[PDB]
């Protein structure tokens, strides 16, 4: 029963068990138009530590700690899927809703980009059934729902003792967002940069999951 | 289960205090991943506020001196005939050609801005681009 | 050697300055039945309509010419604490190439 203990104790001792430093650079984030922002009239107060500056009332994200944010953001996700995490891509935006719902499909995981029906996370125990494994990690691509308010699953998931690693805008509110990354969430180049990135982080985690399962049955 | 008070502290704090008090008999997964690899900012709940009085925003304006060169370039020539292709990374338009020539002519040391402007017009005419000044 | 301030000092959006009546090329990635969506770079896109001239010439993938009105078009109203956006920029169409 110690082999299961050792198979998870080993990856907790390195800053990159899957080497995710290579999965992006600062050049690709600039070349996927992530650094742009909304009008400075719509600029939110909690974004002032995550904004480089303002270009003619268009707000620029400080992309340096964005990578440092994304380093632990990808580190959190791929450590979780190593230990068989249930990852929920909640992204209430009807411009990339078709893209994301196959991203969880071809990464073996789950997504809910539809209208959020009421007691979803909180009253799970009769909406789904008596015993139901709730998601252990919930990724947000658009934290604003289509009325430009905080999506209720942001307020719901952290209430359910579940961490949230979102893409946070320059008009969002990253208060109960545990591993936010300040990024554009509106352009198709930027969300395709995301949808390629999280797809890589799950899949790079899963092949190094299966090899150490072969490592127990290597000797025995 | 545990707590649903999102306003007590961060989720790591409540889960830590709750498992350490030992009512919880099972430690969650993301807890081990959290204290193993922590985030930069603890995500503790904050009610937002509103700036009142002489408080303003500490987010600056982003300017350069080449922006001031582009200012007089746009006041005279407007946009040049070269329509911008913003998929082009190194799209050096007539504003960019004007300002690059202006910088390497400020490297001459002509203090007068008008002869810098005019010799820049001559360097662009030596390059081969027709200037569409509203005369 | 390549820093962050280096990437956006001479970036084209800083190169062109303010988007008050400047010529820009932009392409088509979505069409709904009257309307074509013009992704010209920057944060959002703009939507416009098929003119009768070159009617089925404006298709999926063609470049057009834009006049570039302002990039987001937001305004705070009377009793709102924050302005609402439209996620558009809505420039004026000219022609091709």
């Amino acid at each position: 029963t110690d082999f299961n203990d050792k198979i998870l104790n080993e990856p907790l001792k390195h800053s990159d068990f899957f080497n995710v430093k290579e999965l992006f650079s600062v050049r690709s984030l600039f070349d996927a138009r992530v650094h742009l922002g909304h009008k400075a009239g719509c600029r939110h107060r909690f974004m002032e530590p995550y904004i480089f500056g303002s270009r003619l009332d268009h707000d620029i994200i400080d992309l340096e700690q964005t990578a440092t944010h994304l380093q632990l953001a990808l580190n959190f996700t791929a450590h979780m899927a190593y230990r068989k995490g249930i990852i929920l891509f909640i992204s209430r935006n009807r411009q990339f809703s078709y893209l994301i719902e196959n991203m969880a499909r071809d990464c073996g995981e789950y997504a809910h980009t539809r209208y959020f029906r009421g007691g979803m996370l909180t009253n799970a125990r009769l909406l789904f059934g008596p015993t139901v494994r709730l998601p252990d990690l919930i990724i947000f691509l658009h934290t604003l729902n289509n009325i430009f308010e905080p999506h209720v699953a942001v307020r719901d998931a952290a209430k359910m003792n579940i961490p949230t690693v979102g893409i946070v805008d320059t008009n969002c509110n990253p208060c109960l967002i545990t591993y936010p990354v300040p990024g554009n969430d509106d352009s198709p180049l930027a969300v395709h940069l995301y949808c390629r990135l999280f797809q890589t982080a799950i899949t790079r985690a899963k092949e190094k999951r299966q090899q150490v399962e072969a490592l127990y049955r290597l000797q025995g | 289960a545990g707590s649903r008070l999102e306003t007590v502290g961060s989720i790591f704090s409540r889960t830590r205090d709750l498992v350490r008090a030992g009512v919880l008999k099972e430690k969650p997964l993301w807890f081990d991943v959290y204290d193993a690899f922590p985030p930069l900012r603890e995500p503790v709940f904050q009610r937002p506020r509103v700036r009142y009085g002489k408080a303003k925003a500490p987010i600056q304006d982003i300017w350069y001196h080449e922006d001031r060169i582009r200012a007089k370039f746009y006041s005279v020539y407007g946009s040049g005939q070269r329509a911008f292709d913003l998929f082009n990374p190194n799209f050096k338009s007539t504003c960019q050609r004007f300002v690059e020539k202006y910088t390497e002519l400020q490297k001459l040391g002509e203090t007068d801005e008008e002869k810098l402007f005019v010799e820049t017009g001559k360097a662009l005419l030596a390059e081969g681009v027709i200037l569409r000044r509203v005369g | 050697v390549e820093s962050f301030a280096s990437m956006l000092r001479h970036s084209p959006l800083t190169q062109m300055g303010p988007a008050k009546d400047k010529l820009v090329i932009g392409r088509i990635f979505h069409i709904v039945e009257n309307d074509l969506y013009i992704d010209f770079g920057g944060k959002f896109h703009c939507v416009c309509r098929r003119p009768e001239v070159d009617g089925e010439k404006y298709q999926k993938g063609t470049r057009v010419r834009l006049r570039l009105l302002d990039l987001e078009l937001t305004s705070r109203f009377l009793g709102a604490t924050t302005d609402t956006t439209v996620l558009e920029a809505n420039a004026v169409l000219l022609g091709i190439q």
Binding site: - | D61, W63, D67, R68 | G17, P18
Partner: peptide, 25 residues
């Protein structure tokens, strides 16, 4: 490093439109 923006007084700023009878008496 030297590409850092420098806090100056906002170019591209249009000069404010006087009324039609402004400099007149």
């Amino acid at each position: 490093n030297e590409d850092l923006p420098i806090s100056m007084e906002n170019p591209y700023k249009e000069p404010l439109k006087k009324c039609i009878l402004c400099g007149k008496h």
